[PDB]
Structures are given as structure tokens and as C-alpha cells.
Amino acid sequence: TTALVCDNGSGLVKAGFAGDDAPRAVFPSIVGRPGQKDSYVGDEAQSILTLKYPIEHGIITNWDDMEKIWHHTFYNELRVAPEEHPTLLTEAPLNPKANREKMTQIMFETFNVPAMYVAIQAVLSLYASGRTTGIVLDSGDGVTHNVPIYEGYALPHAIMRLDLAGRDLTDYLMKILTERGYSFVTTAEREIVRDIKEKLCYVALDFENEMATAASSSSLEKSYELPDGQVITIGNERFRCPETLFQPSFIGMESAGIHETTYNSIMKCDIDIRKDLYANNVMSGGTTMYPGIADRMQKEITALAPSTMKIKIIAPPERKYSVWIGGSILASLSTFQQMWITKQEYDEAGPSIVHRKCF
Amino acid sequence: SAALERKISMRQSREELIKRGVLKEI
Ligand SMILES: Nc1ncnc2c1ncn2[C@@H]1O[C@H](COP(=O)(O)OP(=O)(O)OP(=O)(O)O)[C@@H](O)[C@H]1O
Ligand SMILES: C/C1=C/C(=O)O[C@@H]2C[C@@H](CC[C@H](C)/C=C\CC1)O[C@@](O)([C@@H]1CSC(=O)N1)C2
Ligand SMILES: [Mg+2]
């Protein structure tokens, strides 16, 4: 009877039960291929295989493999029968209609859920923070968005999408690590660099001063030892890597950085709501985890915004999972129970019901 | 999450917000 919440990320699936403080299942969004099984899903592939990611930049693009991920989610991870549980799924901001329709059809016709709902990821993180109005910077493995939201509605004309996120930052770290003469080439080595990123990287409050500091001394150098004993030592790469979020030209992307796109997004909204966006800047997703990133955004947004604006960055320690937590809260609400698309409603209206019920 | 539930249940309708020019969909 308990509702299920599933946040399908480009990199990680977060799944569990509404009411819980956290997703009980977190596993890679991959299908791997080598009377053995023909494919290995999630942690199966993790534990000889070529990996495919069914979700790209937050959008489902391999439906056959996505079906495998959901099967793995229900039956192997959560160990539930989906026919017995209302299921809340997440989607990226600006997810195309055809996609949301197909998610809906597969849930009702393939998994036979009794009810379902699709929510925008960024809206859920805002809800997790106890707000229905605000602007969210949601940055994960595959995509980054600025999403201004009023009374629970993402305001689509003002949404900014940026195809720079966690995976690109890992790849960039690998690239600049070659300057010190290191070489990381395999899937397992990319994972090692992902870990270096998650452990040693940070966002400098003043990038140019930090570069000067790093040039002067060894004060910022850190070592990282692989389990095999090989050591890699890292200096200014620590902060140059996530600097890319603020200066996308670092990877050759001629696009505004995340501070500028926050400003642009707000400036596209109704004059009256702007003050409320500035005062309610919520960060969510794994790529917002860098030490210093909240401080840096506070400074940059403050530099762009009028003096009249109180600027507040909300960055809870659990923010890697804010989307899921917001889903867990939403699906457990009394007021939300009339919002589910029911099987009966799908039967009568077809997959396009998702446009009328999920917003 | 009482404060949240309150805010959600009294949200203005999509049609009204589109009519107010707040909500501009793609
Ligand atoms: N402590 C950390 N510091 C920096 N990056 C991190 C940290 N923890 C996780 N990440 C990055 O966040 C990404 C995973 O985050 P998340 O689960 O929010 O992404 P996703 O939901 O799978 O992707 P998306 O929302 O883009 O589709 C990975 O790139 C990971 O390296
Ligand atoms: C610990 C962990 C974190 C993660 O974010 O994992 C996801 C999913 C993962 C899929 C392949 C990997 C070999 C399997 C499991 C790693 C899961 O790819 C990522 O690591 C990719 C590749 S490197 C990077 O930064 N993103 C992100
Ligand atoms: Mg995500």
C-alpha cells in the first residue's frame, strides 16, 4: 500500500518508500553486457562488461534498457510487486511530452502499477527544503539546470539547461591530471578519478588568488593513493576542476557559468517573484557537494544582484538526495492522494493523462 | 510537513497562472 519513489538519474537510481528519510536503494543507472544472463543491471554490472547508460542528460533514450533498470528497481532492489504500490517517478525539467507519455504507458501496461505520478526533479528538491517558491540549482552526473519555481510550478520559459555536470567534471579532471604526467584510461580508472574528485576537489572563493597561492607554495597539494599503492599528487587541479562550473570555457563550452545562469533565470521571471527567488536559492544533486561552492555562489550572485536583494543559498548536507527526499515527502501527503494518475484514469484517457495530471 | 502541505493544497491553478502570464509553457 505504501507508495514507491524512484529518482532516475543519468548516473544513479535512487529508489525507496515514501515516508522514509532516504532511498534504501542507490545503484548505478547502467546495463552491462559481456546459460548465463544476457545482461547485468545496476550493481550487477558494477560487481568484463561493456556499460550502457539508458539515461543521457537526465532524459531516457534507451527504453529497452530503461525497462531493465525499473525491473531491477522493483524486483531485485526494493523486492516489491509494483502492482501493489502507487509509484512516483521523477523527470528532468523540459522532459519532452513523448517521453513522459512513454514512461506512463510502461508503468501501467508493463508494470501494472495501480497508480503513478511524474514530478520534476528540481521541484522535489525545493519541496524537500519546505518551500514551494524558489530557484533551484540541480546538478548531477549528466545535466545541470537552474529552475525557478512558483507555487510548485517550474516556470519553463525561465529554465536554463547546461550539459556540464559530474561526469564531464570527472573527465576534465582526468584530462588535467595528464599535465602532471598521469594517465587514466579504463572504466575502473575513470572511477578512481571520480573518487579523487569527490574527495580532494573544491571551489575556490577567488579563483585567481588561489591559482597564485598554488603557484607560490605547496600548501594546497594533496596525495591520493590507489589501493594498488600507486600515488597521485594533486595541486591546483583540486579547484580548477569544479571552476569549470563557473567558467565553462575550461572544457571549450562557450556558455555562461552557473552563477550567471542563476541570474539570467531569475531575470526572466515576473518582477514580483524575483526577490523571492534570490532569497530562496536551493542547491541539490551530487555536483553541488564541493566544499566552497555555496560560498562562491553567494559571492557571485551578490555581485550580480541589486543591493536591495537579500541573497540566500540553501545547501543542506543531505542535498545529494534532496530530489528523492522531496518525492518521499510529496507522496506521503494527504493532499497529494487525489493527484495520482489512477489505473482507471489511464484506462479511460490513455498516456496523455500525464499532461493533465502531472504539473 | 504541515507548512508544505498547506502551500501545495492552496496553489493557484495552472490555467489561472497561464492567464496571469506567470506560467509560459514551451
Ligand atoms: N562529494 C562530492 N563532490 C563532488 N561531486 C560529487 C560528490 N558526490 C557525488 N558527486 C557527483 O554527483 C554525481 C551523482 O549525483 P546525482 O546522483 O545527483 O546525479 P544523477 O541524479 O544520477 O544525474 P542527473 O540528475 O544529472 O541525471 C556524480 O558525478 C558524482 O561524482
Ligand atoms: C560509487 C558510484 C558513484 C556514481 O556516481 O556512479 C555513477 C554511475 C557510474 C556507472 C559506472 C560505474 C563503474 C559503476 C558504479 C559507480 C557508482 O558512472 C559514474 O561514475 C560516471 C562515470 S565517472 C563519473 O564521474 N560519472 C556515475
Ligand atoms: Mg539527478
Describe what this molecule looks like in 3D.
The complex is a heterodimer of chains A (359) and B (26). With 359 residues, chain A is of the alpha+beta class. Helices cover 38% and strands 20% of the residues of chain A. Chain A folds into 3 domains: 1-120 and 319-359, ATPase, nucleotide binding domain (Nucleotidyltransferase, domain 5, 2-Layer Sandwich); 121-164 and 254-318, Nucleotidyltransferase, domain 5 (2-Layer Sandwich); 165-253, ATPase, substrate binding domain, subdomain 4 (Actin, Chain A, domain 4), CATH 3.90.640.10. In chain A, a hairpin with a 2-residue loop joins strand 12 and strand 13 (153-154). In chain A, helix 4 (121-128) packs across helix 12 (322-331), helix 5 (166-177) crosses helix 6 (187-200) and helix 9 crosses helix 11 (293-304). With 26 residues, chain B is mainly alpha-helical. Residues 11-12, 28, 30, 46, 51, 141, 166-167, 170, 187, 190-191, 194 of chain A line the site of latrunculin B. Chain A: The modification Tele-methylhistidine is found at residue 57.
How is the topology of this model organized?
The complex is a heterodimer of chains A (359) and B (26).
Chain A: E1 4-8, E2 12-17, E3 25-28, E4 31-33, E5 40-41, H1 43-46, E6 50-52, E7 55-56, E8 59-60, H2 63-78, E9 87-91, H3 97-109, E10 115-120, H4 121-128, E11 134-139, E12 144-150, E13 153-154, E14 160-162, H5 166-177, H6 187-200, H7 207-216, E15 222-225, E16 231-234, H8 237-243, H9 258-267, H10 271-278, E17 281-284, H11 293-304, E18 313-314, H12 322-331, E19 341-342, H13 343-349, H14 353-357
Parallel strand pairs in A: 1-9, 9-10, 11-17, 17-18
Antiparallel strand pairs in A: 1-2, 2-3, 4-5, 4-6, 7-8, 10-19, 11-12, 12-13, 12-14, 15-16
Chain B: H1 2-9, H2 14-19
Bound molecules: adenosine-5'-triphosphate, latrunculin B (LAB) and magnesium ion (MG).
Latrunculin B is lined by residues 11-12, 28, 30, 46, 51, 141, 166-167, 170, 187, 190-191, 194 of chain A.
